[PDB]
Scaffold this active site. Structure first.
Site, PDB file in Angstrom:
ATOM      1  N   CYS A  75       0.867  -1.174   0.000  1.00 31.42           N
ATOM      2  CA  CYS A  75       0.000   0.000   0.000  1.00 31.42           C
ATOM      3  C   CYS A  75       0.908   1.230   0.000  1.00 31.42           C
ATOM      4  O   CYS A  75       2.125   1.092  -0.112  1.00 31.42           O
ATOM      5  CB  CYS A  75      -0.982   0.006   1.184  1.00 31.42           C
ATOM      6  SG  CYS A  75      -0.309   0.052   2.822  1.00 31.42           S
TER       7      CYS A  75
ATOM      8  N   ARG B   3      -3.765   0.024   5.515  1.00 32.51           N
ATOM      9  CA  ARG B   3      -4.238  -1.127   4.761  1.00 32.51           C
ATOM     10  C   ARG B   3      -3.357  -2.381   4.806  1.00 32.51           C
ATOM     11  O   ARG B   3      -3.832  -3.440   5.194  1.00 32.51           O
ATOM     12  CB  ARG B   3      -4.497  -0.718   3.303  1.00 32.51           C
ATOM     13  CG  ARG B   3      -5.653   0.260   3.143  1.00 32.51           C
ATOM     14  CD  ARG B   3      -5.667   0.942   1.764  1.00 32.51           C
ATOM     15  NE  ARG B   3      -4.483   1.776   1.568  1.00 32.51           N
ATOM     16  CZ  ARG B   3      -4.222   2.486   0.476  1.00 32.51           C
ATOM     17  NH1 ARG B   3      -5.065   2.474  -0.545  1.00 32.51           N
ATOM     18  NH2 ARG B   3      -3.113   3.220   0.417  1.00 32.51           N
TER      19      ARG B   3
ATOM     20  N   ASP C 290      -7.671   4.183   0.836  1.00 28.73           N
ATOM     21  CA  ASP C 290      -6.775   4.643   1.909  1.00 28.73           C
ATOM     22  C   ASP C 290      -7.627   5.314   2.994  1.00 28.73           C
ATOM     23  O   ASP C 290      -8.267   6.326   2.747  1.00 28.73           O
ATOM     24  CB  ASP C 290      -5.776   5.655   1.339  1.00 28.73           C
ATOM     25  CG  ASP C 290      -4.646   5.989   2.304  1.00 28.73           C
ATOM     26  OD1 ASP C 290      -4.605   5.373   3.389  1.00 28.73           O
ATOM     27  OD2 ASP C 290      -3.807   6.859   1.985  1.00 28.73           O
TER      28      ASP C 290
END
EC number: 3.1.3.48
Length: 154
Positions: A9, A15, A126
């Site tokens: 990520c 995440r 996000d």
């Protein structure tokens, strides 16, 4: 044979820490824990060495999950050593595809983790600027995608 997965990520504080823990618990329950090497990486370097966002730790805790994640950045060698590289969103995927060019013997299958989601919500957003609800969503998608991913690669 032993397989390896790399969750990627942008900052590796939200995440990826969540996806890695979710995947780890899945393979531990199914008892196939030792056939998998699991890790996480960030596209950026800003959070190198950092622990996960507290909101990511809380969310995981709400689901009886713990973690001692320490953020590291993705390197050129990850493309030749890892079997799978599963990322969060469009830019992650783009950034990764771009870097996998400076590498000759690239062998990692770079894919969006959400491409495995049966509810087809391809992109895992996000949550850094959102609230606890956004973190629960990310958790829900990771369960969906990870569970689907496993019953497909073994």
């Amino acid at each position: 044979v032993t397989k390896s997965v790399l969750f990627v990520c942008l900052g590796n504080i939200c995440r990826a820490p969540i996806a890695e823990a979710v995947f780890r618990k899945l393979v531990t329950d199914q008892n196939i824990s030792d056939n998998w090497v699991i890790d996480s990486g960030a596209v950026s370097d800003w959070n190198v060495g950092r622990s996960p966002d507290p909101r990511a730790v809380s969310c995981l805790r709400n689901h009886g999950i713990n973690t001692a994640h320490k953020a590291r950045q993705v390197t050129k060698e990850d493309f030749v050593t890892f079997d799978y590289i599963l990322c969060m969103d469009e830019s992650n995927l783009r950034d990764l595809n771009r870097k996998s060019n400076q590498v000759k013997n690239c062998r990692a299958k770079i894919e969006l983790l959400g491409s495995y989601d049966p509810q087809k919500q391809l992109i895992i957003e996000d949550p850094y600027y959102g609230n606890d609800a956004d973190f629960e969503t990310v958790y829900q998608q990771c369960v969906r995608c990870c569970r689907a991913f496993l019953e497909k690669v073994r």
